[PDB]
Design a protein around this ligand. Sequence first.
Ligand SMILES: O=c1ccn([C@@H]2O[C@H](COP(=O)(O)OP(=O)(O)O)[C@@H](O)[C@H]2O)c(=O)[nH]1
Ligand SMILES: O=c1ccn([C@@H]2O[C@H](COP(=O)(O)OP(=O)(O)O)[C@@H](O)[C@H]2O)c(=O)[nH]1
Ligand SMILES: O=c1ccn([C@@H]2O[C@H](COP(=O)(O)OP(=O)(O)O)[C@@H](O)[C@H]2O)c(=O)[nH]1
Ligand SMILES: Nc1nc2c(ncn2[C@@H]2O[C@H](COP(=O)(O)O)[C@@H](O)[C@H]2O)c(=O)[nH]1
Ligand SMILES: Nc1nc2c(ncn2[C@@H]2O[C@H](COP(=O)(O)O)[C@@H](O)[C@H]2O)c(=O)[nH]1
Ligand SMILES: Nc1nc2c(ncn2[C@@H]2O[C@H](COP(=O)(O)O)[C@@H](O)[C@H]2O)c(=O)[nH]1
Lengths: 267, 267, 267, 236, 236, 236
Amino acid sequence: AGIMRDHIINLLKEGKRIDDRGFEDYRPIEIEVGVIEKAEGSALVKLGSTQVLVGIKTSLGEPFPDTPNMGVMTTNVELVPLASPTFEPGPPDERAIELARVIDRGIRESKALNLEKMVIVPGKIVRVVFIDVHVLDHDGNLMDAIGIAAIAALLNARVPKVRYNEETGEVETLDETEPLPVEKIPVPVTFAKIGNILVVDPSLDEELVMDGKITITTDETGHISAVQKSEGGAFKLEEVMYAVETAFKKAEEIRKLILEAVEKAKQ
Amino acid sequence: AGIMRDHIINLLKEGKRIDDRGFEDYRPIEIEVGVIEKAEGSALVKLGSTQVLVGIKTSLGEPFPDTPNMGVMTTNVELVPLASPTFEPGPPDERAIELARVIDRGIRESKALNLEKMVIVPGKIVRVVFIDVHVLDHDGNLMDAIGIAAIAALLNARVPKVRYNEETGEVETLDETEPLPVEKIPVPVTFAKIGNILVVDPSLDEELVMDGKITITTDETGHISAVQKSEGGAFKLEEVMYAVETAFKKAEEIRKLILEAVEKAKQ
Amino acid sequence: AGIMRDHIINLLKEGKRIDDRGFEDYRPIEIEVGVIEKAEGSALVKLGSTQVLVGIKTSLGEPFPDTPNMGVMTTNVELVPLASPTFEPGPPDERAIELARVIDRGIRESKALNLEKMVIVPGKIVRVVFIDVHVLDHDGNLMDAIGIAAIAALLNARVPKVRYNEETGEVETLDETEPLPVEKIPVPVTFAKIGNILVVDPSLDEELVMDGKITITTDETGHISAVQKSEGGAFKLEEVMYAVETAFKKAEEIRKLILEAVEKAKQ
Amino acid sequence: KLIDENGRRIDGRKKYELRPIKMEVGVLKNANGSAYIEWGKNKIIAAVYGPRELHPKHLQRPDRAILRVRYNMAPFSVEERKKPGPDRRSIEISKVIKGALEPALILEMFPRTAIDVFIEVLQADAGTRVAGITAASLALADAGIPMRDLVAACAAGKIEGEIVLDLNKEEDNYGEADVPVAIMPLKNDITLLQMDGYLTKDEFIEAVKLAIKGAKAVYQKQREALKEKYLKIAQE
Amino acid sequence: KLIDENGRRIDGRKKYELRPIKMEVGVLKNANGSAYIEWGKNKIIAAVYGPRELHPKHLQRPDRAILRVRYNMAPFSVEERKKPGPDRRSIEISKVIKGALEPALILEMFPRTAIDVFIEVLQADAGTRVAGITAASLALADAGIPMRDLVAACAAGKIEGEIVLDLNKEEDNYGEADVPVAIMPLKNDITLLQMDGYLTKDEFIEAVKLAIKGAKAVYQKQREALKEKYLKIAQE
Amino acid sequence: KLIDENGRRIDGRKKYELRPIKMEVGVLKNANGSAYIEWGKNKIIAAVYGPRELHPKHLQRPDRAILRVRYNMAPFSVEERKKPGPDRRSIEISKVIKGALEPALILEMFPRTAIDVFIEVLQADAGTRVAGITAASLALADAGIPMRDLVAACAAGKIEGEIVLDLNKEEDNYGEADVPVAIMPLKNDITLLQMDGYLTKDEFIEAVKLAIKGAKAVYQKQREALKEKYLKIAQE
Ligand SMILES: O=c1ccn([C@@H]2O[C@H](COP(=O)(O)OP(=O)(O)O)[C@@H](O)[C@H]2O)c(=O)[nH]1
Ligand SMILES: O=c1ccn([C@@H]2O[C@H](COP(=O)(O)OP(=O)(O)O)[C@@H](O)[C@H]2O)c(=O)[nH]1
Ligand SMILES: O=c1ccn([C@@H]2O[C@H](COP(=O)(O)OP(=O)(O)O)[C@@H](O)[C@H]2O)c(=O)[nH]1
Ligand SMILES: Nc1nc2c(ncn2[C@@H]2O[C@H](COP(=O)(O)O)[C@@H](O)[C@H]2O)c(=O)[nH]1
Ligand SMILES: Nc1nc2c(ncn2[C@@H]2O[C@H](COP(=O)(O)O)[C@@H](O)[C@H]2O)c(=O)[nH]1
Ligand SMILES: Nc1nc2c(ncn2[C@@H]2O[C@H](COP(=O)(O)O)[C@@H](O)[C@H]2O)c(=O)[nH]1
C-alpha cells in the first residue's frame, strides 16, 4: 500500500484501471438467488471477488405504535471477521451501520418493499421482514453488492400466506407461500473519486486510494431513493450530476441481471 | 499539575484560594431555567466555568410493582466527552453513577419531587420523570452544579395535565400544563478537604489536589437528605459538623438564586 | 510454571502426583448444604482448595412458548475475579459459559431436576429455577466442584408450596416449603490427560500442564448425561472408555458424600 | 396538509428562507475549540480536542492526525426522551460528519495525533447534522486547527411536491425528501451529500444547488462568528 | 409497625446493639489476602491481590500503587434473585469502599502497581458495604499490605423516630435514614460517610457518633481476627 | 413418531448413512485459507488468517502461535431468525472447535502469532460443529498451516431407541442423545467429544465408535477436497 496509490492514480491518468475495467465498468457480477433455502429469501451476490449473502427471514409481529398500517422491515449488515482482516468481532461498527442504513433507506424510501401490503391485522399483527446481510469476502464496493443482494433476496422471497379468520380471531399461517410486496428494484451504484476521476464499482485496491465515495440508489421509475457520499474527499456538483446519470444507467444494467437471477431460481 | 498542589496548599495556609474566593465562597453562579423548551423542564447551571444542563422529560408509564402508589423518577448523568478530557465515551462510569445517585437520593429522600402526587391510575399509570443531566464543561464541583440544575429544572417543569376519564377508562393528555409536585428544594453543597482545610465549591484545580470531598444536601426545612463523602481522604467528626452547618447556609443562598431563576422564566 | 510440567510429568511416570493422590483420587471433599439460608437452596463444595458456592433461587414465571409443560432451569457460573488471578471482571467468558452449559446439560438431560413436576398452570405459570454458581477459589477442577455443588444445592432446595385456586384463578404462594422434584444425582467426574496418563480431579497445577481434559457426568441409573472433552489434547477411544468406567465409580463415591451432606442439613 | 401555503410555510418562511440561526464560538473552557449553534429549534454545542495524543497508539497514523467525530443527542433534545448513548442513526451521522470535516483539515500537520470533534445536540428540530457540521467547523477554527476552508452545511428538501430550503422537524416528518449538503464554499467542494427520500434527478440536483446556497448563507454566518471572535480577542 | 418495642427491636436487640459478627482471615488460597465476615445475615467474602502488575500500563501511577475495588452481590444473596453483574448501586459502593480503604493504605510503597480489592456479598441483609469494608481491611492486613490503620465501618440509622445502631434489612427498608460510616479508629479519621434518608442535623450527627462507636466495636473484632491469625501462624 | 422406519430414516437414510456432503477449498480471496461445506442442509464457510500479528501483544505466547476460533451462525441460518452475535451455545462451540483443531496444529512453528479460525454457519441443520471442524481443517490446510493430521468430525446419536450416524435437525430435536466426535484419523486421536443427552455406557461407546467411522468417511472427503485443490493448482 501507498506504492499502490501512485500506480492507481497513474493508470487512471491514462484512462486505465488496474484490472482493465473502463471507468464505468462493474467487475463480473454473479447473482444467485434462493441459495439459503431455509430462509424465506436469499441472494449470494459476487461483485468480482466481493461476496455478499443476504438472507430474508420474516415472522409475524406487532407493528410500531407510530404505524399500525405497515409491516416491519429491518436491515442489518454483518461484516464478519472472515470477510476481511479489517472486520473485527463485535456489534456493528460505523461501516456496517452505514451500509445497513443506506441500503435500507434505498428500499424503504422507494417503497420497494411495500410495508402497507404487509399488514395482517391493522395495529396488531404485521409481516416482519429481517434483511440480514452477511458479508463473506470484502474486495470493495460492499454498498452495491449489498443493495443488489438485498433487493434480489427480497424479490426471491417466498413467505407463508397468512390469513385472518374473522370467526375465530385466529391468524392461520398457511403452507402456501407468496412473494413479498416488492414493487421496485432500487440498485445502489457507487463511485470512488480518485484524484479528479470517478470510477464505478471500486475494488478494495481502489477503495484504499480513493479520495471519497458516493453512492446513488435509483429504481426503474427514474427516481433516486438514496444518496450517500461516504468517506472523506469532496465532490463537485458536476461530479454528482454525472454520478446520478451514470448510476441510472448502471442500475438498469444491474436490475436486468437481478431480475434474470430471480427468474432463474423459479425454473 | 503537582506543582499546583503546593501552590494551592500554600495559598490555603494564608487563608487564600487561587481565584481569591474565601473558603466559603461559591464561584459566580448562573442559573437559567427553561432553556430546552421542548423538554418539560430544563436548567443550565454555571458554577464558574462548570456548566451543567439538566433536562426533564416526563411520560406516562407503569409504576414499579413494589409501589403502585408512586410516580417514577430516574436520574442519569452523562459526562459527555466534550465536557472534559477525562470524560470518555461509553456507559456511565462510577463518577457519573455516583453523581446521578447522590443527586437522585437528594431529591428522592427529601420527597422534593412528590412521587405520590404523580399517580394517575394507582398501580397502572403514573407520571414518569427522567432527570437527564448533561454535563457540558467540567471545571469542578459537578455535584453541586448538577443538584442545583436538577432541582431548578424540576421547579421549571411544566408537564401535560392528565385526566382519567371514568366513563371511558381513557387517559387524556391535555394541552394545559402544570408544575410537577415539587415541594422542597434540596441543594448539594460540596467541600474539598485540602490538608486540614475545607473549602466550598472546589474548582477543578482544587479537585486535583484535594484529599477528599464531602457533599451535604439539605432542604428549606432544615433537613439533610443526602450525605456523601466522595473520593479518598478522611474527615474529622468536627469537619463533618462544620460542613453540615455551612452547607445549610450555602444551600439557602443557592435556593434563593434557584427560585429567582425559576420565577424569571415565568416573566 | 514450565519447570512444573516436567516435575509433574516425571512424578506421573512413577505413579505419583504432587500431593500424593493416586491417579483415581479426589482431593479432600467438603460439601455443606444450606449455607445461604435466604436462597431456596445452596451448597458450598470444596475440592481440596477449590471452592464453589451454588445458590438456588426460584421464582414463578412463564414457561418458554416451546414448552408450556415444563418449569424453567437456568445455570450461570460466575468466575469472580476473587477466585483467581485468571478470572477478570465482565460477562461470562468461554470458560464460565462452558462450565455452566455442561453442568446444566448434566442435570437437564438426566432430568435430575424434573421440569415437568414444576408446572403450576400449564403454558402460563411455571416454577423458575436459577442455579447460580459463584466460584470462590479456583484451584482446579471447577467442573466437578460446580456439578457437585449444583446438584447438592438442588437436593437442598426448599421452595414455597404453590397452589392454583380454581375458584379465583389466583396463585397462592404458601409459607410451607417442599423439595424441588430432584430425581437423580448427576455428578461430573473430570480427568486431566498428562502425557499418556489420565488423572481424576486435576488440581490447578495439573491443569496447567495437562494435554486435555474430559468430563463424564453420570447418575445412579448407570447413565451418562453429559460428556465434554474440554481444552486441547486428544484422547484415545480406550482412554475415553476407562474414563466413563472410572467416572461411574467416582460419581458413586461422590453421590454418597452429597446425599450425606444433604441429610446432615436436615438434622 | 398543509406544509406550504401561501407560499408561506408553517412558521411563516418562504420556500427558500432559512430558520433563525445564531452562532457563538468559544463557549467552553475545557474544549480546545467550541462553538454553539441555535439553528431553529436546534441548539447544538460542538467541542474540539486538540490535536492530542492518540490513544491507543496502534491507531496513530505516521503521516497525519486522525479526525474522530462523535455526534450525540441528549435524552431531552428530542420530543420523545431518547435513551442515552449512541444508536445507529447517531453513528452514521458521526461517520458522515467526519467525512464532512476531514477534507477541510490539513491532517498531515499533526502526525500521530487525534483531532476529536464532539457534537452534542441539546435540542433537535431537523437539520441537526448540518447544524452540527457548521458548529464543528467553527469549533475547529476556534481550536486554531489549520483548515483549507470552513465547512458549511444545510439541507434542502421536498415538501408538498415542492423543493424547499432548511426543513424543520414537521416538514421533514411529512416531507418527501431531505437533502443535507456540506461544502467547503471557497472551492464549492461537496463534503457531505445525503438524500433520504424519493426524488427525480432534477428534483435531486435542484435540492443540492439550493442547500448549497443555504450553505453559503450559513458560511457567511460562520465567518461573522469568527470575525466577532477576532474582534473580541483584540482586547488588549 | 413496629421496628422498636420495647425497647427491643425485631430480633431482640436494644437500640445500640450490633448484630452477631464473626470474622475469619485467610479463607482463600488464590487471593493474596482474604477475610470472611458474617455480620447478621450478611455473609461476605473479601479477597486482595497483590500489589501486582497493573494492566494496562497507562493506568500505572509513577509514585504509588492504585487501589481498585469491586463490590458485587451474588445473584442468590438477595431475596429477589439479582441478575449477575454490576449495577449502579454496586458501582457506587465499589467507589465509596475504594474511597474508604485508600487513606488506610500506604500506596507510595508500591509504585506502578495495583492493589485489587474484591468484595463478594454471598448473603445480604443491610449493611453490606460497612461489613464489606470491614472484611476488606482485614483482607488487606491479611495480604501483608502496610496500612496506617484498619478501617472499620458500621452504619447507624433512624427507625420509628429513633436513632439506632446497625440496621437490618427490614429496618432499613422501613427506616427513615441509614448512615454508614467508616473510620480509621486510631485517629478517628472518617473515610466513608453516607446518609440515605432524611434527618435533622442533630439526628445526623448522633447517627455518625453512634455508627462510629459501632465501628470501634467492629474494630476490636477486627484486631481479634488478626490476633487469632498471628497465633495460628505461630506454629511452628 | 417415527424417526426410523423401515429401517429407513425420514430422508431415506439407513441408520449408518451420512447426509450428502460436498466440500470446496479456496473459496475466499481475503482469507489465508478457506473451505466451504454442504453437509446436509448445512452450508458452512470456514476462513483462516494467517499466522498473523497477535494483537494485543500481551496475548502473544513466546514459543507458539495461538489458535482462536469463532463459530457463528448467520441470523438467517436457523428456522427462527437468530439475533446476530454470539450466544452461549456459539461460544462453547467456538471453545470446543478450538480444542478440536489445536492438537492438529504445530503451533511452536509460528511463535508470537495468532492463527484465527472463523466458522460461519450459513445454513444450519444439526451437526454444524462437526461440519465446521471439518471445513476448518480444510481451511487450515488451505492456509498452508503445518498440521499433524486433518481433523475430521461427525456426530452419532440415539433416535427412537437406536444408535444412528449423522443426526439431522429433526432427529436431534426428537433424539435421545447427540455425540459429536472429532478425530485426527491417522492416529485415531479424539480431539472433540461431546455427549448431549442420556445414554448408557455401551450406548455411548457405540455412538463414539460409529461417529468416528463417520469421521473417517468425512476425512476421505477432506483429502479428496485437497487432492482436487492440488490438481487445480497444477496449472501451469
Ligand atoms: O431518536 C431520535 C432521532 C431523530 N429525531 C428527530 O428527527 C429529526 C430529523 O431526522 P434526520 O435523521 O434527518 O436527522 P437531522 O435532520 O436532525 O440531521 C431530528 O432532528 C430529530 O428532531 C427524534 O425525534 N428522535
Ligand atoms: O439488588 C439489590 C440490592 C440491595 N438489596 C438489599 O438492600 C439492602 C440495603 O440497601 P443499601 O443500599 O443500604 O446497601 P447495604 O446496606 O447493604 O450496604 C442490601 O443489603 C440488600 O439486602 C436487595 O435486596 N437487592
Ligand atoms: O439459535 C439456534 C441454535 C441452534 N439451532 C439448531 O439446533 C441444531 C442442533 O443443535 P446443537 O446444539 O447440537 O448444534 P449442532 O448440532 O448444529 O452442532 C443446529 O444445527 C440448529 O439447526 C437453532 O435452530 N437456533
Ligand atoms: N414492532 C416490532 N419491531 C421489531 C420486532 N422484532 C424486531 N423489531 C425491530 O427490528 C430491529 C431488529 O432487531 P433484532 O430483533 O434483530 O435484535 C429492532 O431494532 C426492533 O426495533 C417485532 O416483533 N415487532
Ligand atoms: N416502571 C417503569 N419504569 C421505567 C419506565 N421507563 C424507565 N423506567 C426505569 O427508569 C430507568 C430509566 O432507563 P431508560 O428508560 O433511561 O433506559 C430504568 O432503569 C427503568 O427501570 C417505565 O415506563 N415504567
Ligand atoms: N420463560 C422465562 N424465562 C426466563 C425467565 N427469567 C429468566 N428466564 C431465562 O433464563 C435466563 C436467565 O437470565 P437472567 O434472568 O439471569 O438474566 C435467561 O436467558 C432467560 O431466557 C422467566 O421469567 N420466564
